[PDB]
Ligand binder design. Structure first.
Ligand code: HEM
Ligand code: HEM
Lengths: 55, 33, 22, 419, 49, 446, 302, 18
């Protein structure tokens, strides 16, 4: 981890919970969903928000 | 240190920045076609 | 050379830590 | 061009030189103080001392010399042995001066600083590790215990508890004590003798003090056996041979190439070597056999060393050992002596023909004698050995108290009493 | 021992330009790459729109 | 006197002489009682067929087992009776035969050497002995991970051409070989031009050429066809090889990309290319103060126990890369921190940093010339490579060529966004996956 | 396999006392084959131990013939009941081929300690004769387990014979131990670096005096007095007695009452121990060296 | 056999010999 931009801010060390997260080989599209879920959640957040303004 | 290279590449990025930088804002300009 | 009660040294472990001897 | 010119100085330091037409410009310093001067509390000094060259001199900061050397693209060298500790240095023809300067401050301007000093401990094991892979390495030192008592048996390698044991002050004493203009011998190669001679007496004149020679080493018989689980045993048997600098050591040096062979043919089962053949005849399949001779100032050690299998061990021994008796019985082939000389002379030459090998052999004379024998007369000296000479020399070998060291499974291993 | 290994052949997946081993891989290499990147650049663009 | 400028001038030059049947003669005078005679052979592993593999190796052993005229181990005794050292060696392209000797016994040497060059005692006495000896060795050769990992790398890219194959070939042909193929492969590739002859020592040329002459004016050693000169462009394949084994302490890992052939100007620049990185291993006296970025840093955390680099340029091909050793849990480090030491060169590089390397390679080649034999070996490859050329001072001129732009032009070719191949051996486990390395070769400018 | 790590932890603690460390290396100097074998696994021998090996060695050296059982306070029948029952297996037995061949030699091992350990021993007789007892007399003649704490021991000549010609702290004891096919009698010393060689001859030549015919017969009595009592005070304890019971068993298979033993003790003649003592200096002797060897002589100085 | 041996450390390279 010599001069790795992961540890320079301590923060990005946490960010190594993802890059190097090991993963299984054979995986259905059916494992897209977990990550897929959060997607909707975000995109929502904006919509009802700007909607919240005029309502 | 008289850093030699990256001087040209530098001009590029701000320019690479520059061109699209209007391509966002879009306003009075010259060429259309 | 320490024996003097007996012949030489020892080896024992059962429980109690271990014991060497003369 | 001109051949060896060595100029005795008032400092006792002999400055020898040539000049070449070659771009190679090299220099080295040879000093008498090896392991053999480490006393019971002086142990490991050299072993570690040799490793110090990267430190901060009083002349220069360590970091400096570092960026100093590579910038030149030049190269530095360090070497030690039981007797003559040496530093070696080389760079291109032109610029040696700056580096020449550097050579000075090293031995000239030492600095010992605990943080500097102590932090280099861990290097030792990493060091002491790799050499110990080859048991042949591991075999050598224990051997010297069996043949001596006091000094020569001292290792080139720091004893283990001796490691956390090394303070700075100790060094600086040992520094100056065994460092004197009298004991320091400098050699040039391709450079003007004057620029050599210029700086020579200048920085290199200090004292005085201490060559203290009190180690006669007292060759003393004994054997040692150390038990491993290996499937290939290592064992040697050596009798005291003569001191260096006589045809006697040469008689063994004859007698080695008589019996002993550095391989002249790869993969070859070596027929011209009797012993190896005299072994495999009466013995069975893999093994390896070599007779050993090495000498020093006050003595030399001649014998043989064998590597075979567990049961193979004792078998090889006498088969080899009694084979030696045959020549000690007056058995000889005089043409072999010639071939041996033929081998001996050539092999010697082929060693000396290289520059650096020659470089050593030059200054090897220096701390020894201070003169230069032309190789011609050497070759003449080679011929000078009589046949019965080596014979009686060989007779001594079986004729005197012999020493053994044991490395491997000892399951079948005989003692000396079987021999 | 170790010696007996030999890499199995994938070539079905390859394209024939490098299918000749007596080609230096460098020659097609020139044009070879960009088409791959060409998608890369290409695929990227419409996104920005 | 001696000045590095003058010293380039005063040289005994290489000599050129031809025979009629294609053998070449050459020589240089060392003013020396001793001389190194050798013979070089361009017969490559890549010439032999798959069945023929390992033969020459096996063959090389057979040479000194006694020859057609001179049966087994009467041979060695003479050279031993002389006292001369005798040795030979092989390489995927090249096989060597040579002796260190005095100038005195020179006359027999050739006529000794000459006989065995082609005339060979062919007897099944040895065929099984060597086979067993070789089967002994083949199974023993598994001990050094170093020599292990190489061959993988060849097969990695050079799959599809004989170039990648083992010198010693499959264990099976070791059993399966009849000396017909030997004689047959003895037959084809041992005629000239394939043959190249030289020697060096106190010999000058003439007094060689006289006693060159008639064997081996000669015994032919021929030139007819035996195809011509058959070789083919070898395939350069971006790929990987992974043999995962968790027992051993360390994992030898090295990395490479293909490169130019022997003869080319770029052949020069690459010499200084590796001069830049330097190399670190455990017991160097280097310490943290070293100038080379990785040599200091990869030692700082001991991200490596050891590493070095390699450069080899074949006829039509060349190899570039480094070979390194480190503990497994940290392996990722080297790989991350190796790359930029290429990449930062490719953009930001510097003149002064080269000087030392410029100096080093200068320092390097000069020191190469000590001792009789090394010159002798040079000649052979040179002839097989550049022919006659010993551009001694010209090297410096070839070196003086070098410029900061020159460099930043070179690496532009062979590195920035290229396709490497991956050679690795257990415990590979943590080795970053391929597609990283690829997207890790070219910077994003980061 | 999981019990490997226990070994070092085991092998550790005993090695603190060099006196422990001293014993084993010694046996190398006096023998060749078997007796010199350690009670402690050699180091590379540790990753070396498979199960199958054991089970062979299990049954091989385990036989009803070689097994000896002792009861204490319980009905002999319940003893005798189960006795032949489970404990009868084979056979195979006993593989005695080790004569151990007492063989001279010395060994020197270098530490940085300020207190050296060295011993010198000559072969004494086998167990089960007044000869071993003669040394067992001769030990308590010269050698003393401390009978008075803190006391500088006057009745021991050697210790006095040392300190008279020697200086500041040290410790001196003569050593004797025997077995079936032999016994080892000698002395072992711990002194300072310069102190080493000094103590040696001062102790060593002191031994010569008794080997010169010098003896005090009342001492023999006191020695017996010591010898008998100390023996008793060892046997008086139950477990010590417990051992001494079955110690006979694998040895003889009979029981000598301590009375006759005491009678046997008296039976030793004076010149007996003398000539026995004569042998000691009269035969090839062995040495082991633990400490700074700086001043340490070899056997050749002795 | 061996020289007997030697020791080499110096700076950038190193090895052990016989
Ligand atoms: C919007 C709601 C949720 C979000 C954003 C979410 C997020 C995730 C993510 C990112 C993963 C990893 C990828 C994956 O395994 O799918 C995951 C896994 C998982 N989640 Fe959630 N999840 C949600 C709802 C749930 C619910 C409702 C349950 C159970 C009632 C659940 C139980 C699990 C389980 C069991 C896994 C692991 C499944 C596997 O191993 O394949 N999650 N979730
Ligand atoms: C998964 C995320 C969410 C869901 C399922 C949800 C649920 C709903 C529902 C059921 C409606 C009314 C349906 C309709 O109008 O047709 C709605 C509209 C709305 N939601 Fe959410 N909500 C979510 C997150 C949010 C967020 C993030 C906001 C504000 C930032 C929000 C605020 C609103 C507002 C303000 C409306 C008014 C627009 C409208 O009702 O037409 N909700 N949302």
């Amino acid at each position: 981890m010599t001069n790795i931009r992961k540890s320079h801010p301590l923060m990005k060390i946490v960010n190594n919970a993802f890059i190097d997260l090991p993963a299984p080989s054979n995986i259905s599209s059916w494992w897209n969903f977990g990550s897929l879920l959060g997607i909707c959640l975000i995109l929502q957040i904006l919509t009802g928000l700007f909607l919240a303004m005029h309502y | 240190q008289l850093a030699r290279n990256w001087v040209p590449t530098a001009s590029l990025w701000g320019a690479v920045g520059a061109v699209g930088l209007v391509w966002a804002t879009d306003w009075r300009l010259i060429l259309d076609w | 050379g320490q024996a003097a009660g007996r012949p030489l040294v020892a080896s024992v472990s059962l429980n109690v830590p271990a014991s060497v001897r003369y | 061009p001109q051949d060896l010119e060595f100029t005795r100085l008032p400092n006792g330091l002999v400055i020898a030189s040539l000049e070449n037409y070659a771009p190679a410009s090299r220099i080295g310093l040879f000093i008498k103080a090896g392991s053999r001067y480490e006393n019971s509390n002086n142990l490991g000094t050299s072993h570690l001392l040799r490793l110090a060259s990267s430190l901060t001199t009083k002349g220069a900061s360590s970091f400096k010399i570092t960026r100093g050397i590579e910038a030149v693209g030049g190269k530095l060298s360090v070497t030690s042995t039981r007797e003559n500790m040496a530093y070696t240095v080389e760079c291109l023809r032109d610029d040696v001066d700056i580096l020449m300067e550097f050579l000075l401050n090293v031995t000239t301007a030492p600095e010992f600083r605990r943080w500097e000093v102590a932090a280099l401990q861990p290097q030792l094991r990493i060091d002491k590790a790799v050499a110990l892979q080859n048991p042949q390495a591991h075999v050598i030192e224990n051997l010297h215990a069996a043949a001596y008592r006091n000094a020569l048996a001292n290792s080139l390698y720091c004893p283990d508890y001796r490691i956390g044991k090394v303070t700075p002050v100790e060094l600086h004493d040992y520094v100056q004590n065994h460092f004197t203009s009298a004991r320091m011998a400098l050699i040039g190669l391709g450079v003007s003798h004057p620029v050599l001679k210029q700086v020579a007496e200048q920085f290199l004149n200090i004292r005085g003090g201490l060559g203290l020679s009190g180690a006669k080493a007292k060759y003393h018989g004994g054997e040692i056996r150390e038990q491993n689980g290996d499937s290939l045993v290592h064992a040697a048997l050596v009798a005291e041979s003569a001191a260096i600098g006589s045809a006697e050591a040469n008689a063994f040096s004859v007698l080695q190439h008589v019996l002993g062979a550095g391989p002249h043919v790869k993969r070859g089962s070596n027929a011209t070597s009797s012993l190896y053949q005299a072994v495999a005849k009466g013995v069975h399949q893999p093994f390896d056999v070599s007779a050993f001779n090495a000498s020093y100032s006050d003595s030399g050690l001649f014998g043989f060393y064998t590597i075979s299998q567990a049961a193979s061990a004792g078998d090889v021994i006498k088969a080899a050992y009694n084979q030696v008796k045959t020549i000690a019985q007056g058995n000889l082939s005089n043409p072999d002596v010639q071939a041996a000389k033929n081998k001996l002379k050539a092999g010697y030459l082929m060693s000396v023909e290289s520059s650096e090998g020659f470089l050593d052999e030059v200054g090897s004379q220096a701390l020894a004698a201070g003169s230069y024998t032309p190789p011609s007369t050497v070759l003449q000296q080679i011929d000078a050995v009589a046949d019965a000479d080596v014979i009686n020399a060989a007779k001594k070998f079986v004729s005197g108290r012999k020493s053994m060291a044991a490395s491997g499974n000892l399951g079948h291993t005989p003692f000396i009493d079987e021999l | 021992s170790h010696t007996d290994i030999k890499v199995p052949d994938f070539s079905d997946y390859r394209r024939p330009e490098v299918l000749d081993s007596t080609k230096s891989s460098k020659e097609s290499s020139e044009a070879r790459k960009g088409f791959s990147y060409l998608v890369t650049a290409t695929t990227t663009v419409g996104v920005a729109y | 006197t001696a000045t590095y400028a003058q010293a380039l001038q005063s040289v005994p030059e290489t000599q050129v002489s031809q025979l009629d049947n294609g053998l070449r003669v050459a020589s240089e005078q060392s003013s020396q009682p001793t001389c190194t005679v050798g013979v070089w052979i361009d017969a490559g592993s890549r010439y032999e067929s798959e069945k023929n593999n390992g033969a020459g190796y096996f063959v090389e052993h057979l040479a000194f087992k006694g020859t057609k005229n001179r049966p087994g181990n009467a041979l060695e005794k003479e050279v031993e009776s002389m006292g001369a050292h005798l040795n030979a060696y092989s390489t995927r392209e090249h096989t060597a035969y040579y002796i260190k000797a005095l100038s005195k016994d020179l006359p027999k040497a050739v006529e000794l050497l000459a006989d065995i060059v082609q005339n060979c005692s062919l007897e099944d006495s040895q065929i099984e002995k060597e086979r067993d000896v070789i089967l002994q060795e083949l199974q023993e050769n598994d001990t050094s991970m170093r020599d292990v990992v190489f061959n993988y790398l060849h097969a990695t890219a050079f799959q599809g051409t004989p170039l990648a194959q083992s010198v010693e070939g499959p264990s099976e042909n070791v059993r399966k070989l009849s000396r017909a193929d030997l004689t047959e492969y003895l037959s084809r590739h041992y005629k000239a031009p394939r043959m190249v002859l030289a020697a060096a020592g106190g010999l000058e040329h003439r007094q060689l050429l006289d006693l060159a002459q008639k064997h081996f004016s000669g015994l032919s050693g021929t030139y007819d066809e035996d195809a011509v000169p058959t070789l083919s462009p070898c395939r350069f394949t971006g790929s990987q090889i992974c043999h995962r084994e968790d027992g051993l302490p360390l994992a030898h890992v090295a990395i490479a990309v293909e490169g130019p052939g022997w003869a080319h100007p770029d052949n020069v620049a690459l010499q200084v290319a590796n001069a830049i990185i330097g190399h670190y291993d455990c017991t160097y006296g280097g310490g943290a103060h070293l100038s080379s970025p990785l040599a200091s840093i990869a030692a700082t955390n001991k991200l490596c126990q050891s590493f070095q680099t390699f450069n080899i340029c074949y006829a039509d091909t060349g190899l570039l890369g480094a070979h390194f050793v480190c503990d497994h849990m940290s392996i990722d480090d080297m790989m991350f921190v190796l790359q930029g030491q290429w990449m930062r060169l490719c953009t930001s590089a510097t003149e002064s940093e080269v000087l030392r390397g410029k100096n080093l390679l200068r320092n390097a080649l000069v020191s190469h010339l000590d001792g009789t034999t090394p010159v002798c070996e040079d000649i052979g490859r040179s002839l097989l490579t550049y022919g006659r050329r010993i551009p001694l001072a010209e090297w410096e001129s070839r070196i003086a060529e070098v410029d900061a732009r020159v460099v930043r032009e070179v690496c532009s070719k062979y590195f920035y966004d290229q396709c490497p191949a991956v050679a690795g051996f257990g415990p590979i486990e943590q080795l970053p996956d391929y597609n990283r390395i690829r997207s890790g070769m070219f910077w994003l400018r980061f």
